[PDB]
Amino acid sequence: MTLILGIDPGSRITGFGVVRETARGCEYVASGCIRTGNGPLHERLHVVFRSVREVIRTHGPTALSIEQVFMARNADSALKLGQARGAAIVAAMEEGLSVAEYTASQVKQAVVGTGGADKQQVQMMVMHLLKLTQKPQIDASDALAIALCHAHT
Amino acid sequence: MTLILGIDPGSRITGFGVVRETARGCEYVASGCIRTGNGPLHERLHVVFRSVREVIRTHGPTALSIEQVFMARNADSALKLGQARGAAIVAAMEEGLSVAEYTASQVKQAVVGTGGADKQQVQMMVMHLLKLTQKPQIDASDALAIALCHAHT
């Protein structure tokens, strides 16, 4: 019942996490990082688009969960972040996924239990809820957190 | 001879312009506005993606020309502009277009003859070089300007 893709866009790294809702909770399906540090800006964007599509086609999530951007650090970061976010969103929508947006506070409330949880609490609760031994990279962990936020709504 | 697509992205309005490289200069093919005002963001980004792809399938440009963002007006502005910009660029590349980026000053040098031309001179030289009778909407003529910049160069 519902496989969910969470995306954590970034200027240089876009994290992704796929989880499967179970009656018991959520099972880990996949996670990782799409790295876009090198090359022409347009090649970086198209890798994000193509990689998100291929994650979707491989694992069959029907729901995209993303995090509302609140405060970017500056206008340059916001622009690069936005370009990667847009490229990831239209890739999800080309595959026909629904799209839900949650603030950072909603994500932390659903995963940790309080909107002011720090990064360590989030990463630990992501590994607790998904029964992971291996500490995932922070972008993949955030993306998993965002996916879990959408689960069982 | 090349058919060239120029794109002027925007959260609310994305201008497009298509020109054809002739040996005598450049011929007008199409231009207009992609309006994404009302609706959730992801539906707005998907309109941009699908509309840009539709322009490309209709008029057959094989090259994308886009303008570099140097200074966004602010970080709220930059975020929304980057999202539209990423949606438009990955649409172009899914269709297999090459991509060329020029600075605002290169665009004005190629079209008006000098890098500091104002919006008035640019719109008139767009109409002069393409023998247009009607003033295009501003986003359309910027898009045409950006397309003209790539021609022959």
Domain B1-153 adopts which CATH fold? Nucleotidyltransferase; domain 5 (3.30.420)
In whole angstroms, give the CA distance from residue A51 to residue A64: 14
B45 touches chain A (CB under 8 A): yes
Rounded to whole angstroms, what are the CA distances from A137 to A5, A77, A81, A142, A144?
Answer: 16, 21, 19, 9, 11
Query: Encoding tokens for residue A125?
Result: 């609760």
In whole angstroms, give the CA distance from residue A71 to residue A67: 12
DSSP track, B75-137? HHHHHHHHHHHHHHHHHHHHTT-EEEEE-HHHHHHHHTSSTT--HHHHHHHHHHHTT-SSPPP
Rg for chain A, CA atoms, rounded: 14
Task: Name the experimental technique.
Answer: X-ray
Whether A91 and B90 have beta carbons less than 8 Å apart is answered as: yes
Show me where the domains of chain B are located.
Answer: 1-153
Most A-contacting residue of B83, B101, B102 (CB-CB within 10 A), to test interface: B83
Listed in order, strand segments (DSSP E) in A68-124 are 98-102
Residue ranges of the binding site of A for Mg(2+): 8, 67, 139
* DSSP H or E run through A31: strand A26-35
Return the biggest CA–CA distance within chain A. Answer: 45
- CB contact under 8 Å between A86 and B45, yes or no, is yes
DSSP state of A74: S
Whether A54 and A13 have beta carbons less than 8 Å apart is answered as: no
Query: Encoding tokens for residue A37?
Result: 């540090």
Strands B13-22 vs B3-8: parallel, antiparallel or unpaired: antiparallel
The vertex-B56 CA angle with B54 and B59, nearest 5°, equals 105
To the nearest whole Å, the CA of A7 is away from the closest chain B CA by: 14
Report the candidate in B61, B68, B62, B137 with the shortest Cα–Cα distance to residue B108: B68
Residue B128 amino acid letter:
H
Categorise residue A131: left if φ over 0, alpha if ψ from -120 to 50, beta otherwise: left
Name residue B66's beta-bridge partners.
B7, B101
In whole angstroms, give the CA distance from residue A59 to residue B110: 48
Whether B90 and A46 have beta carbons less than 8 Å apart is answered as: yes
- CB contact under 8 Å between B78 and A76, yes or no, is yes
Query: Encoding tokens for residue A26?
Result: 């959520």
DSSP track, A4-27? EEEEE--SSEEEEEEEEE-SSSEE
Residue ranges of the binding site of B: 8, 67, 139
DSSP state of B4: E
